[model samples]
Target chain A: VKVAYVQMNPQILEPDKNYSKAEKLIKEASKQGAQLVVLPELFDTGYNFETREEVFEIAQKIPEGETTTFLMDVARDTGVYIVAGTAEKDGDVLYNSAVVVGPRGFIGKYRKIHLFYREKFFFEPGDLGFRVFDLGFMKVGVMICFDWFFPESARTLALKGADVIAHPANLVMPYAPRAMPIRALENKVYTVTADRVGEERGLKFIGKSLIASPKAEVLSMASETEEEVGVAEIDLSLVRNKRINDLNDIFKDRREEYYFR
Target chain B: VKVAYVQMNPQILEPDKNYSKAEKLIKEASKQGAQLVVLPELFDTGYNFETREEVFEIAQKIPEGETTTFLMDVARDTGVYIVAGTAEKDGDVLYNSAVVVGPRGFIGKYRKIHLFYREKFFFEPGDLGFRVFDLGFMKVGVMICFDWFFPESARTLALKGADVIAHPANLVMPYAPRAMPIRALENKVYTVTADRVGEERGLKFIGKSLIASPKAEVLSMASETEEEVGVAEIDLSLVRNKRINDLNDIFKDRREEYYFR
Candidate 1:
């Protein structure tokens, strides 16, 4: 399958402008034969909010939200799958989430489990937990932003048999890009990290979007300041076969009894 | 504290030659003012054994083992701690283990958990769980070669308050070196990976010995084909403070209930 990561700068408070930017990249990615296109976290609504009122003002209900509807429309129109990075408003609480939509319509979503920096003040710790969705072509899992910091997020998805990890990130730290390879190599799964670039308020999001193979090979990576739609073809057969050698299976070699006990 | 990684090529069966090589490096590291010295896995004994008989022939009892006594004497004489990567014999079975010895005497041992490749044929699976040893200056933990492939190994050690991970490896796969930085950044601990170089019985070991910091920065890395004794100074304060930002602590952010449940 061919996957693309949309690396673009999203403007704060201008949800309309951010949606237009996302639309262009999604279409460009579709034209390039990408079956899956991933956009940056909170692709429409920008990060770095100073107040909870502002965060709630921009946040919308799941599925019924304008952001999810836009994603559903794009996925249906482009004949592609989209892992929408958005802010979810559930009653009085908010969650940093990644919502997945395909050609068939709305699929599922994963709330960001490990919130980063100032996100703690506004968003509730993800209650849904980590999940894997069968996208027919491959098993897909979603994790938003700071979720990458915790090995448990990826490990849980991998243990649930996810062949691909769709990570939508508004990254400020430089650690996650280098760290993602370990996530891929250890789990023997592909990872598509979609990140944003440019300064929002005082916070700067470093935009080096990456696509890594099961061997931890950097298949494709975008520049630090460029708005790029990077695409790479992946083989699920390499992922399906977990054997590292004749005598070893990555998953089978796990001594669960010896871990954390 | 100053730490050293001895990256040397160990012969298949020449125990005397390998011991002489290790002695020179340990003394050299001590001369360079290194307080802790780490050696590759099975530093004295060969890694690729044709039969269990050959493994038992070379392996000896822990503490009473010739290798342990050699490590103890060298550490006492050089006034530097040694993490001996050796083959341990217990009754009839053999274990791929790392024995720690200090200026005072022998400390403890950790059998290699999550054995890789052909090791399954000769070595017994590690029975003792991961442990942290408070060595005055810092708390240290041990894990061998293939253990780097499992995040559980390092995570358990970090959870046990290990300030640093002393990894002794006879690495065949090209993945562990790159994978270790993630372990460091995720757990906020320093990692010293001591690896052997050269081929044995058609099995080749990659030798890119490395020392990584809490921020996942590569402080020092040796060449792939060199007999190097690289040393670096690390501050325990950096490892002790798990906070990434004013609002976040790496360990405090962990949602253990959401992991693998």
Candidate 2:
């Protein structure tokens, strides 16, 4: 499977410019026969928190949102899966949400369950847990930025048969490198993290995006720059081999019955 | 409070040598005015697959185990709390366990719930989740090596008002700096991770033992070496102040009610 990560520097709360910038990368990734492509978090409005009310004008619901509708046509036209971050508005509430759009249109979405500090004051907490979508050959789980902090989110998805995890994030701080690998290692699934770059409303993003295998091996990486695209070929076969051939049953031997106790 | 992370280099299946080395460190840490001291995972009999049978022979059963009793005496004499890792045997079954011994005696014991690979073949998984003990000024939670992977364990303890989390680990293979900060950052609590060092039956323990504050700041760290100890003095009051001033009601905002669907 070939995957691409986009390190975009979206204009602060400028939906039209950010959408145009990200669309070009999607088309390029699709042209290169990429099976999956991921975008950065809040690509529609960037991470502009102060003008959340103004940003809500651009935010849309999962199916009705402009970002979702635009990505749907791109996924359908390219016959590929596009996992991108967007500003989702539900009623009077707004959230940092990621959607998975395949050839069949909107597959599913996972809200940013664990929000960054002060984000809760602006946006509603994501009530939905991790959800996975069957991509025929393999299943993929979508995780937002803060959701990476919780192991249960990944474990829960992995337990439900997610072979790959696509992460769309707008990281403001330099994460301890072990943060992503620990998720991959613990869940025993391939992970592709797409982080945006530059500052939005004084919040700087640490945009070292990369695609990692289940063994915590980096397959591809992107620099911290706008309009940067990183491509990596992921061997889906390794995902099956790692879990099934694991003599130790490290992944299968998870004691969830006791872990949450 | 002053703390010490004792990185052990125990010989796999060798109880006498491991015990002697651990005793030396315990005495040394106590003499150094370290109020809290921690040992690595499976300190007695080593952390190896073949040691399953030997684990039973070398293992202690909480208050009945020789190592526990010995450490209890050490804690009483040294005037320090001891969080030591050891394999525990309950009849024919063995468990990866950590026992916390206060000056008075057995403060608490936590078995490793999320076992490492091949560990399930040798030991039964621990059912008791995270537990905290009143340590006069602050309450501390004890978690074993593999248990560190799960954030729910730390959050559960912190939600119950645990100030510090003591982790004893036998980290085999290379150093994983990425997953190290989950304990401190996810739960907004102090974390002390003491990893074993040296080779035991072809498996090398990575000894990047660390102590981090609630703000995910590394206070002290140790490199991979035999019989190395890292010490640091932290303002324990900072944990409480950070929680009250900034992190108050953070966990409560988790909207777990609607996510289960």
Candidate 3:
């Protein structure tokens, strides 16, 4: 299967303009034969909120919201699955979320559990928990920005049988992109990181978006400052067979009892 | 604290030859002011044993056997702590183990939990769980070659308050070295990978022994085929302080309830 990740700068508080840009990239990705296209965190909305009130003003309801609704149309119109990044408002509570929409319409959404920096003041911790959404063609999991620092975010998805992990990131730190290859290597899963370029509120976003294979190889990577879509072809079978050699399998070799306190 | 990892070729079935090479590297590293030095897995006994009998012959008991005694003498003489990689014999069972000896005397030992390829046939799974040894100056943890493949191996040590993880690896796959940076990044710890070079019984070992910092940077990397001791200075405080920003702490941010089934 072929997958594409969009690395574009999202203008803060400019939802309409952001939607147009994301729509074009999604269409271009589909045109290049991407069955699934991933976008950076807060694709249509924006990141770096000053207060909860600011977050509430831009955050929209999950499925019923403007961003998710727009993504559903784009997915249906282009015949591609879109893991659209957004700020989701659940009642008065808000979460950093990634909504997965397919050609058939809305599929599922994942709330970012590990909130980063100023996000703590504006968002509630993800209550829905880590989950995998099976798109029939393949099973994929969703995780938003800052969740990359936590290995458990990807580990839970792999344990639940995810072949690919769609990561929507607004990475300010260099560790996120470099961290994916090891995450893919250890879990025997493919990871597609869609990170935004440019800066917001004094914080500069690093945008080397990439697709890492099960072998710990960075199959495709976008430029650090340019807005581009990078695609990489991956085999789900390679992920399914977790065996590194005749005597060892990555999943079977896990010593989970010793993982934490 | 200053740390060093030795990268050298271990001859199969030649225990004495391997010991001389390791001793010379330890002395050299100590002369360079490295308080803690790490050696490749099975440094004295070599890897790729065809029969359990061959492993039983070279394997030694902790602190009381030939390899451990040799290491203790070197530690006492040079006044440097050494994480000596060896094949351990505990009665009838053998384990891929690392014995730690400090300037005073014997410190502790850790058996390899995650065995690779042919090691499973000759050695039993490690009985002792992961542990951290306090060296007055710094707390260190030990894990064998294939243990790098499992995230839990490093996570367990990090949770146990390990500042640096001494990884003694006879790596054949390219994923091991590349995976360390992410491991260090996610755990917020320093990782010193001591890997052997050259082919052993049809299988070739990769020799890019490296020191990865808490920032996920490879501070020092040895050549792919060389007998060199690479040194890098690290702060124990980096591992202790897991916070990435004002609101985020890598350890405190964990959502463990959703880690695995």
Give Cα-based local distance difference scores for all models. Answer: 0.89, 0.76, 0.88
Off by over 4 Å in 1: none
lDDT of 1 by residue, B1-261 (tens): 899899998897778898899999999989988898999999988788888888788786889978898889899899988887898999988889999999998999999988888789999998898877889888998889889988989999998888889999988878777888888889999999999998888888899999988888888888888888889898999999889899999889999888876
What shift in Å separates residue B69 of candidate 2 from its native position after superposition? 2.5
lDDT of 3 by residue, B1-261 (tens): 899998989998787888888889999999888989999999888898889998798788987998888888889889999997899899888888999998788899999988888788988888788989998789998888888878888888998989999999999888777789888988999999999998888888889999999888999999888999989889887789988778878888888776774
Docking quality tier of model 3: medium
TM-score of chain B of each: 0.98, 0.92, 0.98
Second chain TM-score for model 2: 0.92
Name the weakest run of 10 consecutive residues (lDDT summed) in model 3 chain B: B252-261
TM-score to native of every candidate shown? 0.98, 0.87, 0.97
* Quality class of the docking in candidate 2, CAPRI style: acceptable
- Candidate with maximal lDDT: 1
lDDT of 1 at B113: 88
What TM-score would you report for chain A in candidate 2? 0.93
Off by over 4 Å in 2: A49-53, A61-65, A89-95, A115-123, A176-178, A240-247, B11-16, B49-55, B117-122, B175-178, B241-250, B258-261
Best by DockQ: 1
Give the alpha carbon lDDT tens digit for every residue of A1-261 in model 2: 788887789898678898788888888877777889999888877776775677777678888778899889888887879888887888988877888988888888878887777776667767677788898977988888867665556666776777888889887666634467667776678888888888766777888888877777877777766568778887776676544335445555545464333
Candidate 2 lDDT over B174-235, as tens digits, reads 53444556567666788888889887777777788898876667888888775777787767
- Quantify how close model 2 is to the true structure by its C-alpha RMSD in Å: 3.2
Mind giving the per-residue lDDT tens digits that candidate 1 earns over A7-120? 999988788898899999999999999999999998888998889888699887889988888888889999999997888999888988889999879998888888888888
